[PDB]
Amino acid sequence: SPSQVRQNYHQDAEAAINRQINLELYASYVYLSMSCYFDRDDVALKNFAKYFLHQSHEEREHAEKLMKLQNQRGGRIFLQDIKKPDRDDWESGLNAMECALHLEKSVNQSLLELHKLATDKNDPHLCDFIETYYLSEQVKSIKELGDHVTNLRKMGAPEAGMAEYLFDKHTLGG
Amino acid sequence: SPSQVRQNYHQDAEAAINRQINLELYASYVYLSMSCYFDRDDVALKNFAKYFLHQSHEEREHAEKLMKLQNQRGGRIFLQDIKKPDRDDWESGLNAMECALHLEKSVNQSLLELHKLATDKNDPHLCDFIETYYLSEQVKSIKELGDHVTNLRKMGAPEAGMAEYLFDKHTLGGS
Amino acid sequence: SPSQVRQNYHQDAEAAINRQINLELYASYVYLSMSCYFDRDDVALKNFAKYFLHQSHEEREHAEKLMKLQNQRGGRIFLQDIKKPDRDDWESGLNAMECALHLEKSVNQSLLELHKLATDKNDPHLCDFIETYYLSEQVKSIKELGDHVTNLRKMGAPEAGMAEYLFDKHTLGG
Amino acid sequence: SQVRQNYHQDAEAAINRQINLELYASYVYLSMSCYFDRDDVALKNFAKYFLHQSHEEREHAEKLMKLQNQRGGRIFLQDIKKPDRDDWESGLNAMECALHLEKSVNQSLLELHKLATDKNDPHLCDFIETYYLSEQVKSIKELGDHVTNLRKMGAPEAGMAEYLFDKHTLGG
Amino acid sequence: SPSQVRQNYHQDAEAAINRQINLELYASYVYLSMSCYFDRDDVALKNFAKYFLHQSHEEREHAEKLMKLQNQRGGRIFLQDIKKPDRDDWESGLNAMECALHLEKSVNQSLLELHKLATDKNDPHLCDFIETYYLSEQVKSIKELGDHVTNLRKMGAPEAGMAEYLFDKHTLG
Amino acid sequence: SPSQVRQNYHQDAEAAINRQINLELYASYVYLSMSCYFDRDDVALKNFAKYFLHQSHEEREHAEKLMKLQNQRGGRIFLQDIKKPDRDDWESGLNAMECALHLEKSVNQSLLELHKLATDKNDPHLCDFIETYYLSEQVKSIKELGDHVTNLRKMGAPEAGMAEYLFDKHTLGGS
Ligand SMILES: [Tb+3]
Ligand SMILES: [Tb+3]
Ligand SMILES: [Tb+3]
Ligand SMILES: [Tb+3]
Ligand SMILES: [Tb+3]
Ligand SMILES: [Tb+3]
Ligand SMILES: [Tb+3]
Ligand SMILES: [Tb+3]
């Protein structure tokens, strides 16, 4: 039962988007876990929790956009189980940013492989969609997280207690 | 090594919230699957997709509110795998509302069992929290879905194709 | 063949709401009778009539809200005959407030027995519903009427005819 | 009473029965409004329509109570009887029963006017003419239109008939 | 003897509110003592003083609401002596928040026992009153103070004197 | 142990402020008891309760200002137990005003003795502080209460029931 709107859309590209959708929703669920960690009483960092809550909502937005793309090209969405985060306790603010940096680069690697697949199968619309909305956004996110990890390291976190506290107020803020 | 903020909060109630958090996140993920079904070209119902997209975000807000409650009472959040929906193809608008009605009642019963646990362990704050923010909302949601299923049945869906089309415009896209 | 929306809703609770609906409508009809008494030319207390007219409409709202609750929980509304008030002539302003005080406490008594019924059958939504919208209102209404009876008693009504006149303008005027 | 003038005791008693009939009409419309609010019916604007009519019938009853006091008459309330049926079946049937109700109320007002004319009470005649008789003919005509449309559209057998009538006519 | 407005209100519940009223007024007086400590020249922390001054007035407002509840249910208010705080000197910003955390939990414990008493005597209005206004506020207050103590502990107070200064400006200010 | 800001501030004056702080808080607690009495159902006087509630909060402001003064002069605040009112039942509106009149004069007497102690120890700032904020306000309060008592006595309270009722609306119910 091929779709009426389907044109120049390969089955491997269709399946690759379905895996990417799960990975975007996974990223959202990892960021949601990070947000709730800093909301705890024994951690108590409000702007850290707000930061990762916003990232979780943006990952959800990215996942919904892939679902939109899938329906536009005539592909069918087949959802899978969103796996839990690798750890519940995220230790500290620096560690969460370090894990977030690794997470975004892992998502970026998947998007590069997704674009690579689109390039091989001669799908220029899918290439443009990944280029415009995702590849530009990931490089910005990776750079942003890279800056936050660097500052937290220089300030002396997590050994220095005032480092993570002052980083919560100034950098992240409102 | 108990939490400094913890007081009159049993570990069974703490564990029950963790399961409820997962069930609320599950409900959101089911509604997200429903929303994307009507977005498809072979279904093409825009306000149906908008309806379940709004309901999906509400369930996420309900889930995040439980996570806030868990930290407020000194409990620790232990997340689990969010299971996928029972079906990808939701057949029709009537069936999705029927499955949504079945889903909300399953969520409502978990909250009733959660309230029953809170009553047995003498936790009045947890009882009020469930009463104020959830139980009132669930009865309203079950009633709303009950109204939509009834109208779609009377109108003649899904046999009458114009029924689900007109229901998309009038009920779900206006007042 | 139970209702599709019905869940954790016992038939005794359903029947008790139907009796409560009648009692709320009864209360509205009693206040309507009180309102019309002070509207008479041989009584001529305008704000007294306006006060009980407002209370009568609130009792109608309370009755309509129970009907909405009955439909929400999957219960079926079965209406009965609204009985007339115990008396047409309400004697005086003080006596009407005393009868209104007795009425509100009788309604409050029924709501406490209704909440008692709801607690026995493990119905937390029905408990919260009665707690939020009714029990808070009844205690406020009983206290409000308790104040009005006290003032009218001290001022010297209904023997002192100027007492009920001044009470109409100052207390019930605003 | 000091205010009473040219007001016969039969006319006073006839208003008391009319007050009960107006309060009865309000209670019937309230029952109809609750029927469409049910989950197995689920028609929102049908419920809002009869809820508005119910509050108007209450407002009509309060106006007769004021008239009674204006003319020096004493109000003697009676038991408001319950509606003949709880289950109103469908939207068409509720409008048909509502049409029958308004004509029954109108008939009582015509008999009330006849009594006022017989006892030479011009103020009572004008009061019924201005505020009620004009409104009743408007209400009967309005309900007559709604029943006709619902019959034409094919209610209650046609499922979308009562659904579309809920949105277009009664919604507005 | 009994009040005209009284209905389904036990004498033990009436007495329990009077003790709660005194406990709420006590809490206000403890926060007033804490507020004055940071206003001193040898401590000098303005937003710390403002914080506990605000908390003192909220406890005052909570006490007045119980008094209003007592009169609504037909109960008679019998006041007692408001005791002084256990200490005049509150050491530091961290210790004051720790003592404030201990205070709120002690008040919360009384309200939980008060609700349990109301549940035992079949008083649903008294249960709802405590659930709506007090239990929600106390849990929120305990969580808020729990966050402040944690931040002050990490930053290194009271050994690090700059920690409590920056906490005054950023968090409380 | 000493205060860097302390200058020309004797320890007897410091101790006198601490007793005055307790007396101001005592006055606030007495007015709070009066306010709650008229809020009762068997008394039922709203603007009477409202009047003494305003007075209760003003006495708290006066108490907090002494605490501020104490810290400005390098003095250390030592709090004591706030004693209960002499009676719970305040009988009537006239009696409460008479007890309030007696209370304010007792507070004024303490402030006069406090000022005389400040004059004796040559502390001009403490003299100015008591003159500006307290002594001027106390004379106005005593005069204000003196008017209310006299009006209630003439009108015929507490024997005349309408006396206290009409006084509640006109004089006290202006705000
Ligand atoms: Tb992404
Ligand atoms: Tb939910
Ligand atoms: Tb509750
Ligand atoms: Tb009511
Ligand atoms: Tb009519
Ligand atoms: Tb004419
Ligand atoms: Tb409190
Ligand atoms: Tb003073």
PDB file of C-alpha atoms in Angstrom, chain C residues 13-95:
ATOM      1  CA  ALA C  13     -23.804   7.447  45.928  1.00  0.00           C
ATOM      2  CA  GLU C  14     -25.732   7.909  42.663  1.00  0.00           C
ATOM      3  CA  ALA C  15     -29.056   7.752  44.537  1.00  0.00           C
ATOM      4  CA  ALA C  16     -27.816  10.088  47.300  1.00  0.00           C
ATOM      5  CA  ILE C  17     -26.856  12.769  44.741  1.00  0.00           C
ATOM      6  CA  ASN C  18     -30.400  12.639  43.307  1.00  0.00           C
ATOM      7  CA  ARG C  19     -31.810  13.294  46.796  1.00  0.00           C
ATOM      8  CA  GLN C  20     -29.229  16.066  47.306  1.00  0.00           C
ATOM      9  CA  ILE C  21     -30.270  17.657  43.986  1.00  0.00           C
ATOM     10  CA  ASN C  22     -33.873  17.768  45.256  1.00  0.00           C
ATOM     11  CA  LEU C  23     -32.719  19.275  48.575  1.00  0.00           C
ATOM     12  CA  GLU C  24     -30.715  21.994  46.776  1.00  0.00           C
ATOM     13  CA  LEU C  25     -33.744  22.782  44.590  1.00  0.00           C
ATOM     14  CA  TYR C  26     -35.885  22.752  47.749  1.00  0.00           C
ATOM     15  CA  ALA C  27     -33.504  25.247  49.388  1.00  0.00           C
ATOM     16  CA  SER C  28     -33.750  27.486  46.301  1.00  0.00           C
ATOM     17  CA  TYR C  29     -37.561  27.366  46.494  1.00  0.00           C
ATOM     18  CA  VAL C  30     -37.538  28.267  50.215  1.00  0.00           C
ATOM     19  CA  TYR C  31     -35.300  31.309  49.610  1.00  0.00           C
ATOM     20  CA  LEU C  32     -37.547  32.359  46.703  1.00  0.00           C
ATOM     21  CA  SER C  33     -40.512  32.319  49.113  1.00  0.00           C
ATOM     22  CA  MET C  34     -38.531  34.392  51.635  1.00  0.00           C
ATOM     23  CA  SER C  35     -37.552  36.909  48.934  1.00  0.00           C
ATOM     24  CA  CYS C  36     -41.187  37.456  47.902  1.00  0.00           C
ATOM     25  CA  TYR C  37     -42.297  37.971  51.528  1.00  0.00           C
ATOM     26  CA  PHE C  38     -40.143  41.083  52.025  1.00  0.00           C
ATOM     27  CA  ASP C  39     -41.212  42.340  48.577  1.00  0.00           C
ATOM     28  CA  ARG C  40     -44.788  42.614  49.950  1.00  0.00           C
ATOM     29  CA  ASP C  41     -46.164  46.082  50.725  1.00  0.00           C
ATOM     30  CA  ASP C  42     -46.955  45.226  54.378  1.00  0.00           C
ATOM     31  CA  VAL C  43     -43.297  44.231  54.941  1.00  0.00           C
ATOM     32  CA  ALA C  44     -41.484  46.501  52.449  1.00  0.00           C
ATOM     33  CA  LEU C  45     -37.840  45.491  52.987  1.00  0.00           C
ATOM     34  CA  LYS C  46     -36.172  45.739  49.580  1.00  0.00           C
ATOM     35  CA  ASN C  47     -32.589  44.634  50.331  1.00  0.00           C
ATOM     36  CA  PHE C  48     -33.909  41.712  52.415  1.00  0.00           C
ATOM     37  CA  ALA C  49     -35.825  40.570  49.321  1.00  0.00           C
ATOM     38  CA  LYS C  50     -32.726  41.171  47.177  1.00  0.00           C
ATOM     39  CA  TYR C  51     -30.531  39.203  49.613  1.00  0.00           C
ATOM     40  CA  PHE C  52     -32.679  36.049  49.619  1.00  0.00           C
ATOM     41  CA  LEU C  53     -33.197  36.375  45.841  1.00  0.00           C
ATOM     42  CA  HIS C  54     -29.414  36.153  45.375  1.00  0.00           C
ATOM     43  CA  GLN C  55     -29.233  33.172  47.755  1.00  0.00           C
ATOM     44  CA  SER C  56     -32.070  31.476  45.840  1.00  0.00           C
ATOM     45  CA  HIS C  57     -30.104  31.728  42.569  1.00  0.00           C
ATOM     46  CA  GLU C  58     -26.977  30.321  44.269  1.00  0.00           C
ATOM     47  CA  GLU C  59     -28.985  27.279  45.421  1.00  0.00           C
ATOM     48  CA  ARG C  60     -30.102  26.788  41.800  1.00  0.00           C
ATOM     49  CA  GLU C  61     -26.432  26.889  40.740  1.00  0.00           C
ATOM     50  CA  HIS C  62     -25.612  24.327  43.447  1.00  0.00           C
ATOM     51  CA  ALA C  63     -28.391  22.079  42.098  1.00  0.00           C
ATOM     52  CA  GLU C  64     -27.194  22.443  38.483  1.00  0.00           C
ATOM     53  CA  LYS C  65     -23.606  21.610  39.515  1.00  0.00           C
ATOM     54  CA  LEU C  66     -24.772  18.333  41.121  1.00  0.00           C
ATOM     55  CA  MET C  67     -26.588  17.471  37.875  1.00  0.00           C
ATOM     56  CA  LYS C  68     -23.330  18.061  35.973  1.00  0.00           C
ATOM     57  CA  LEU C  69     -21.448  15.844  38.454  1.00  0.00           C
ATOM     58  CA  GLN C  70     -24.071  13.099  38.056  1.00  0.00           C
ATOM     59  CA  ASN C  71     -23.621  13.137  34.263  1.00  0.00           C
ATOM     60  CA  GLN C  72     -19.806  13.308  34.537  1.00  0.00           C
ATOM     61  CA  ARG C  73     -19.606  10.133  36.659  1.00  0.00           C
ATOM     62  CA  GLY C  74     -22.029   8.196  34.406  1.00  0.00           C
ATOM     63  CA  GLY C  75     -24.984   8.379  36.811  1.00  0.00           C
ATOM     64  CA  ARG C  76     -28.559   9.022  35.680  1.00  0.00           C
ATOM     65  CA  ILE C  77     -30.613  11.935  37.029  1.00  0.00           C
ATOM     66  CA  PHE C  78     -34.068  11.078  38.400  1.00  0.00           C
ATOM     67  CA  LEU C  79     -35.984  14.212  39.413  1.00  0.00           C
ATOM     68  CA  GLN C  80     -38.691  14.342  42.094  1.00  0.00           C
ATOM     69  CA  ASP C  81     -41.376  16.794  43.255  1.00  0.00           C
ATOM     70  CA  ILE C  82     -39.970  19.960  44.847  1.00  0.00           C
ATOM     71  CA  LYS C  83     -41.939  20.355  48.088  1.00  0.00           C
ATOM     72  CA  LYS C  84     -43.303  23.764  49.110  1.00  0.00           C
ATOM     73  CA  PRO C  85     -41.854  25.715  52.076  1.00  0.00           C
ATOM     74  CA  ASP C  86     -43.096  24.987  55.618  1.00  0.00           C
ATOM     75  CA  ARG C  87     -44.736  28.442  55.749  1.00  0.00           C
ATOM     76  CA  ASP C  88     -45.701  31.227  53.327  1.00  0.00           C
ATOM     77  CA  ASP C  89     -45.726  34.013  55.927  1.00  0.00           C
ATOM     78  CA  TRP C  90     -42.198  34.356  57.358  1.00  0.00           C
ATOM     79  CA  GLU C  91     -43.217  36.793  60.155  1.00  0.00           C
ATOM     80  CA  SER C  92     -40.113  39.026  60.228  1.00  0.00           C
ATOM     81  CA  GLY C  93     -36.522  39.594  59.063  1.00  0.00           C
ATOM     82  CA  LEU C  94     -35.047  37.922  62.151  1.00  0.00           C
ATOM     83  CA  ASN C  95     -37.310  34.866  61.849  1.00  0.00           C
TER      84      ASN C  95
END
